[PDB]
């Protein structure tokens, strides 16, 4: 499904990303916008055979199992199909892990190119929360 920006902001804040690893809520909302255009079914194939899944484009090499990624680690311990759900619980809980490796949100390349350093607080203005 395609999330609306404020509804995604509310579910992300409820699931604990506001200020997770010091990154304000607007960062995660902006990330979803540029990684998948807020579409929970988005998929993106990589040259290393991995695929990026869901609203936060979680990579199949290190985070979830898709059975077709060659040297996969399934740190999140889940099938990638579970990252394609309308329910973002599993993607947010895996995204938390992704952000805690010592490098912040830098693995989300579209975040890095489109959101980082920008006025990401704008992505949540006009939202209940």
């Amino acid at each position, epitope marked *: 499904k395609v999330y609306g920006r404020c509804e995604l902001a509310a579910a992300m804040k409820r699931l604990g990303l506001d200020n997770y690893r010091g990154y304000s809520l607007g960062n995660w909302v902006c990330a979803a916008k540029f990684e998948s255009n807020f579409n929970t079914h988005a998929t993106n194939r990589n040259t290393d055979g991995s695929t990026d899944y869901g609203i936060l484009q979680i990579n199949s090499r290190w985070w979830c199992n898709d059975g077709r990624t060659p*040297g996969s*680690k399934n*740190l999140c311990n889940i099938p990638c199909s579970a990252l394609l759900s309308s329910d973002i619980t599993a993607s947010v809980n895996c995204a938390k892990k992704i952000a805690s490796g*010592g*490098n*912040g949100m*830098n*693995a989300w390349v579209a975040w*890095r190119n489109r959101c980082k*350093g920008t006025d990401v607080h704008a992505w949540i203005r006009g939202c209940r929360l």
Partner: single-chain antibody, 222 residues
């Protein structure tokens, strides 16, 4: 060819200042956090701080704030470490590093010679093992959150290598023989048949809450 070239062994008098550098190649530092680590002559690892070079924001272990300052210059791809009022306790090897799931890389280190809070407990401090024995080292904390713990292996004279990520996942290229376990506060590293390449010092690092902290280490001897 991914790398961090550390610039300069130095000898200084008590009270002097030194500024070290760490230039990277293969990746832009603006795209990362750059961490600095201290290691005294027969002692353990200590996290000093990190810098986010894209915006210059830094985070320190409060004990180093005022003595060590991290700085970064993105056009030169270089991160720096400035140390002030140097004393006997500052004689150490200082590494820069990029920590990222399955992408850890460290500089070769740089020796500085001065010449005139989560607790990680590592057991055993030192041990003698045999040629095909089963070894289990442990690491106990004060609630590491779920498994934000790295296992590093350091050989005499080399930068530490990462063996385990997220407590139980093997690094790329690490032999089958190694394995990690636990969640919560209690973690372990097991080597089934100790191979001869395994003689070294093992350290656990918690990156679950900031200031990142290291266990005291375990020297395995064959």
């Amino acid at each position: 060819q991914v790398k961090l070239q550390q610039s300069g062994a130095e000898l200084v008098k008590p009270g002097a200042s030194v500024k070290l550098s760490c230039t990277a190649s293969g990746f832009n530092i603006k795209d990362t956090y750059m961490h600095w680590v201290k290691q005294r002559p027969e002692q353990g690892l200590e996290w000093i701080g990190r810098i986010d070079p894209a915006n210059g924001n830094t985070k320190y272990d409060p004990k180093f704030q005022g003595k060590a300052t991290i700085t970064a210059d993105t056009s030169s791809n270089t991160a720096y470490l400035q140390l002030s009022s140097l004393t006997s306790e500052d004689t150490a090897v200082y590494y820069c590093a990029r920590w990222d799931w399955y992408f850890d890389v460290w500089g070769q280190g740089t020796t500085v010679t001065v010449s005139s809070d989560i607790e990680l407990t590592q057991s055993p401090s030192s041990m003698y093992t045999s040629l095909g024995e089963r070894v289990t080292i442990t690491c106990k904390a004060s609630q590491d959150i779920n498994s934000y713990l790295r296992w590093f292996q350091q050989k005499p004279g080399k930068s530490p290598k990462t063996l385990i990520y997220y407590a139980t996942s093997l690094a790329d290229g690490v032999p089958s023989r190694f394995s990690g376990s636990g969640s919560g506060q209690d973690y372990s590293l097991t080597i089934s048949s100790l191979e001869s390449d395994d003689t070294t010092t093992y350290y656990c690092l918690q990156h679950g809450e900031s200031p990142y902290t290291f266990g005291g280490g375990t020297k395995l001897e064959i």
